[PDB]
Amino acid sequence: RALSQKEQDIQMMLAADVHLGTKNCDFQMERYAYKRRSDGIYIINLGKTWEKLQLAARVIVAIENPQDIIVQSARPYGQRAVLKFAQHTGANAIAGRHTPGTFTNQMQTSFSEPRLLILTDPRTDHQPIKESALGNIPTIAFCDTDSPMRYVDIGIPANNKGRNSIGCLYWLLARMVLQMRGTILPGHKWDVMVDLFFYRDP
Amino acid sequence: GRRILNDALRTMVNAERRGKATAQLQPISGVMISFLNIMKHRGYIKNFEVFDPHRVGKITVELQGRIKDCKALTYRQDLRATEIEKYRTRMLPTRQWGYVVVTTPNGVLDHEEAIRQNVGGQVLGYFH
Amino acid sequence: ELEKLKHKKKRLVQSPNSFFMDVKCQGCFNITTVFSHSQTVVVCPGCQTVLCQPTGGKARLTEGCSFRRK
Amino acid sequence: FEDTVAQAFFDLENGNQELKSDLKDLYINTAIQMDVVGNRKAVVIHVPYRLRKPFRKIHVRLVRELEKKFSGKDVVFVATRRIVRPPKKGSAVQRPRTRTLTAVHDGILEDVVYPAEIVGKRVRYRLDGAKVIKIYLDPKERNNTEYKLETFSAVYRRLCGKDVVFEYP
Amino acid sequence: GRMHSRGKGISSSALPYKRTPPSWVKTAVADVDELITKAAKKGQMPSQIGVLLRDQHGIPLVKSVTGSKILRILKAHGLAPEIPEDLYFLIKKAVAIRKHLERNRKDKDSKFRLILVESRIHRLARYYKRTKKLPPTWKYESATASTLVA
Amino acid sequence: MQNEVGDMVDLYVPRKCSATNRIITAKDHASVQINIGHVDENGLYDGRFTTFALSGFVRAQGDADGSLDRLWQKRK
RNA sequence: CCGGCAUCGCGCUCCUAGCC
Numbered sequence: 001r002a003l004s005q006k007e008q009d010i011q012m013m014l015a016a017d018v019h020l021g022t023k024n025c026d027f028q029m030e031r032y033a034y035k036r037r038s039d040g041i042y043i044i045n046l047g048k049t050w051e052k053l054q055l056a057a058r059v060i061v062a063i064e065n066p067q068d069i070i071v072q073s074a075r076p077y078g079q080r081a082v083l084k085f086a087q088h089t090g091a092n093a094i095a096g097r098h099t100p101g102t103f104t105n106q107m108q109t110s111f112s113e114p115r116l117l118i119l120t121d122p123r124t125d126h127q128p129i130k131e132s133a134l135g136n137i138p139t140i141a142f143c144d145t146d147s148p149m150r151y152v153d154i155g156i157p158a159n160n161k162g163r164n165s166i167g168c169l170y171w172l173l174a175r176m177v178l179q180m181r182g183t184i185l186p187g188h189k190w191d192v193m194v195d196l197f198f199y200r201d202p
Numbered sequence: 203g204r205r206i207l208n209d210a211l212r213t214m215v216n217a218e219r220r221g222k223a224t225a226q227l228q229p230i231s232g233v234m235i236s237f238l239n240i241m242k243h244r245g246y247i248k249n250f251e252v253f254d255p256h257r258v259g260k261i262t263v264e265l266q267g268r269i270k271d272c273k274a275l276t277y278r279q280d281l282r283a284t285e286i287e288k289y290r291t292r293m294l295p296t297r298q299w300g301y302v303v304v305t306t307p308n309g310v311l312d313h314e315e316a317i318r319q320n321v322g323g324q325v326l327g328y329f330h
Numbered sequence: 331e332l333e334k335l336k337h338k339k340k341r342l343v344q345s346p347n348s349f350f351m352d353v354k355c356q357g358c359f360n361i362t363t364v365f366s367h368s369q370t371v372v373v374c375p376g377c378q379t380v381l382c383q384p385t386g387g388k389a390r391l392t393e394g395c396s397f398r399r400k
Numbered sequence: 401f402e403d404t405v406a407q408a409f410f411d412l413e414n415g416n417q418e419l420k421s422d423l424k425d426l427y428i429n430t431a432i433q434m435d436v437v438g439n440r441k442a443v444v445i446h447v448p449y450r451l452r453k454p455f456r457k458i459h460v461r462l463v464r465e466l467e468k469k470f471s472g473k474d475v476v477f478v479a480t481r482r483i484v485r486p487p488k489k490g491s492a493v494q495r496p497r498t499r500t501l502t503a504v505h506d507g508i509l510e511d512v513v514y515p516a517e518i519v520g521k522r523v524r525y526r527l528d529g530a531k532v533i534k535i536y537l538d539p540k541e542r543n544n545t546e547y548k549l550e551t552f553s554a555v556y557r558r559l560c561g562k563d564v565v566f567e568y569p
Numbered sequence: 570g571r572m573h574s575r576g577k578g579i580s581s582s583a584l585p586y587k588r589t590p591p592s593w594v595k596t597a598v599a600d601v602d603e604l605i606t607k608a609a610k611k612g613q614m615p616s617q618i619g620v621l622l623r624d625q626h627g628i629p630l631v632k633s634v635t636g637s638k639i640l641r642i643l644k645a646h647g648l649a650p651e652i653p654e655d656l657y658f659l660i661k662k663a664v665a666i667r668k669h670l671e672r673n674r675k676d677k678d679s680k681f682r683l684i685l686v687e688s689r690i691h692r693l694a695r696y697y698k699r700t701k702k703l704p705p706t707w708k709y710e711s712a713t714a715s716t717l718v719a
Numbered sequence: 720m721q722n723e724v725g726d727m728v729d730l731y732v733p734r735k736c737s738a739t740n741r742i743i744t745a746k747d748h749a750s751v752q753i754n755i756g757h758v759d760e761n762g763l764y765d766g767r768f769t770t771f772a773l774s775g776f777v778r779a780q781g782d783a784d785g786s787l788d789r790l791w792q793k794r795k
Numbered sequence: 796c797c798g799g800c801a802u803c804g805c806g807c808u809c810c811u812a813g814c815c
C-alpha cells in the first residue's frame with residue numbers, strides 16, 4: 001500500500017505547524033480543538049481541518065465563473081499565498097488594505113459583486129466580513145482558535161498566524177479545487193510546489 | 203417562588219427564539235405533559251421525553267422550528283363555551299390558526315375541541 | 331462524557347459524589363467500612379488506632395491505611 | 401396448563417438436595433402461557449404476595465429448572481397485586497398510595513426484571529401519540545437476562561399494557 | 570434563598586437513584602432497629618443517630634435498609650422527643666442568645682438575631698400546632714424556656 | 720396562501736432558513752444561499768449540488784459554521 | 796362526535812325493575 005491523500009495532507013499540515021493553535025479558544029471554535037497542553041496552547045483536530053477543507057473545496061468548485069470569487073489577506077504573510085491561489089484557481093486576489101465600500105458602494109471604481117469571499121483571518125480581515133453582511137456574500141475563512149465567527153459560513157480551523165501554515169493551507173485548497181475541476185487527474189501528480197506559497201522577506 | 207407551566211413555556215419560547223433544537227424543563231407535571239400533547243398533535247413541536255431520576259421530574263423537548271409564541275394565562279380565568287370567541291380574538295393572531303388551551307372536566311384540550319364537545323373550563327395558555 | 335465534572339445536583343440524573351470504603355490499618359488487618367466524608371474521628375474496635383480525620387470535605391485517612399472504594 | 405405446571409412445580413423436592421427449605425411452602429395463584437414474537441412462546445407465573453421475598457431470594461436455580469423441568473420455552477415470575485379503581489368524587493376513603501396503578505405497575509416493572517436492578521427510566525412520546533418506556537438496567541447481570549428482553553416486553557404488554565424496551569448503559 | 574438572609578447557597582445532600590440497600594450491606598433490619606433504639610435511649614436525636622449509622626456501622630440510609638424513616642422507628646418504640654428536634658434546637662439557641670443578652674445589653678446585633686430566632690420559633694410552632702405534633706396549647710415563654718431543655 | 724376556489728393568491732412563497740426555519744425576508748441582506756457540489760467519480764464534479772440557506776440571525780450569532788457543519792452531514 | 800361494554804368496575808330491600 002501507499003499513503004492516502006488524507007494521510008499525506010495530514011503529514012504536510014503537521015509539518016507546517018498547522019496543528020498548533022493559541023492559548024485561548026473562542027467557544028464557537030471549541031468544536032474543533034482536541035486538547036490543551038501544559039503550555040496552555042490548544043491543538044487543532046487536523047482531521048476536522050481536512051474535512052472543512054473538503055467542504056470549502058466543494059463550495060469553491062461549484063462556482064461556474066471563478067472570476068466571481070474574491071480572496072483576501074490583510075496580513076503580510078498571506079500576500080504571496082492569496083496571489084498564487086488566485087492565479088492557479090482563477091479567482092480575484094486583493095492583498096493588503098481593503099477599501100471600505102468595495103462591496104456596498106456601487107459608484108466606487110473599486111467595486112465588486114463577489115459570489116464568494118475567502119479570508120485568511122477573521123480578526124484582521126473584519127472589514128470585508130462586515131461588508132459581506134450587506135451583500136448576501138457567503139464567506140470562507142481560516143479561523144484560529146481565537147477567531148470570532150460572526151458572519152462566517154465555512155470556517156477552516158487552523159493556525160493562520162504562521163508563515164508555513166498559511167502557505168500550505170492555500171496550496172492545499174488550490175490542489176483540491178484543481179482535482180475536482182479535473183485539471184489534476186486522479187493520481188497525486190501536481191507539479192506546483194508548496195514553496196511557491198510561503199512569502200518572501202526581502 | 204414557583205408556579206410551573208410558566209417556566210416550561212417561557213423556557214420553550216426562549217429556546218425556540220434562539221434556534222436551539224433541544225429544550226429541558228426541570229419541574230414537570232401532568233399538566234405540562236398534557237399541554238405538550240396538544241402542542242404535538244397540532245404540529246408545533248417534535249417528540250419529547252420524560253427523564254425520571256426520582257423527583258418532581260424532568261423532560262426534554264425537541265423543537266421543530268415552527269412555534270412562534272407559547273405562553274400561560276396565569277390567573278386562570280373561568281371560561282365558558284360562549285366567551286371562547288372573545289378570548290381568541292384578544293389572544294390569537296387571527297381566526298385561522300393558533301390555539302387556546304383550556305382545562306375542562308373532560309381533560310385538557312384546545313378551544314376548538316372544546317367547541318365541538320361543548321364544554322367550558324379554565325384557560326391555561328396559548329400557543330401559535 | 332462531561333457530566334462527571336458537573337455539580338452533584340445539576341446532572342441529568344442526580345447522583346452523590348461520596349463513597350463508602352473498606353479501610354485497613356497496619357496492626358490489625360481487619361477491614362472497616364467508613365464514609366468518605368466522615369464527620370467523626372473513628373477508631374477500629376480492635377487495634378484502637380485513630381483511623382480517619384474529619385475535614386471540610388472528604389475525610390483524611392491516617393498514615394499507611396489502605397482503602398478500597400466499594 | 402395450570403395443572404401441568406402445577407405438577408411440574410409439585411415435585412422437584414426429590415433430589416437436588418440444595419433446593420430444600422424453599423418449595424415445601426408455596427402455591428402459585430396462576431400460570432399462563434403467552435406468545436412472544438417469532439412463534440416462540442413463554443409463560444408467566446403469579447405468586448400471590450406473601451412469599452415474594454422467598455422467590456426473589458432464589459429465583460435463579462429454579463427459573464432454570466422450569467426451563468429443564470419444562471424445557472420448551474421461557475418462564476417469568478411476578479407477585480399478584482390488587483389494583484383498586486380510584487375513589488369516587490369525595491367519598492372519605494383515602495386509598496393508601498399502594499394498590500395504585502402507578503405503584504403496582506412499578507412493582508411489576510421491578511419484578512419482571514428481578515435478577516437485574518433498575519437504574520433508569522425514560523418515557524418517550526412519539527409524534528402521533530405512541531408512548532415508549534425505555535428502561536436502563538444495571539450493566540452487571542447482563543449475560544443472565546439479555547435474551548428474555550423481548551420476552552420481558554411481551555410480559556409487560558400483557559398485565560400492564562405498555563410498550564417498554566430495555567437497554568444497558 | 571435563606572429565610573432570614575440574602576444567602577443563596579445550594580449545598581445539600583443528594584440521595585442516589587437506587588432505593589434498595591447496596592449489595593455489600595448485609596445487616597438485618599432488627600439489628601439496625603436495635604442500634605437506633607440504643608442510641609435514642611442514650612439521648613441522641615434522629616440526626617445524630619443517622620450520622621452515627623452512616624459513620625460507624627456502614628448504614629447509608631435507614632429508610633433504604635429498613636424501609637422506615639428513623640423518626641417513625643423512634644415513634645413506634647415510643648421514644649420520639651416531646652418537642653420536635655428542629656424546634657428543640659431553635660429553643661436552645663434562643664435561650665443561649667437571651668442568656669448572652671442579659672450580660673451585654675448594648676449588643677444590638679444579638680438583639681436583632683434574637684428577634685430573628687424567635688420569629689423562626691413562632692413559625693415552626695405554628696406549623697407544629699397545625700399538624701398535631703404539639704398540644705394545641707403549647708406556647709413559648711421567654712421566662713420559662715430553660716426548664717424544658719438542657 | 721390558497722383562495723378557497725383552489726387558486727394560489729400569495730406571490731413569492733419565501734425561503735426558510737435551513738437551520739432555524741425562520742423566514743428569509745426580502746430585505747434580509749445578511750442571509751446567504753450555499754450550493755455545495757457533489758463529487759461522484761472520474762472528474763469528481765458535475766453540475767450537481769445541494770443548497771442550504773442561512774438567515775442573518777444565524778450568521779450574526781456566529782452559529783452559521785456549526786449549523787452548516789451539521790447540515791452537510793446528511794447522507795445520500 | 797358519542798353511546799354501550801369489557802381489563803384486576805365497595806353492595807343494595809324500597810321508584811323506575813330485561814326476555815337469571
Ligand SMILES: [Mg+2]
Nearest residue numbers: 570577578579
Ligand atoms: Mg435558589
Ligand SMILES: [Mg+2]
Nearest residue numbers: 571572573574
Ligand atoms: Mg421572608
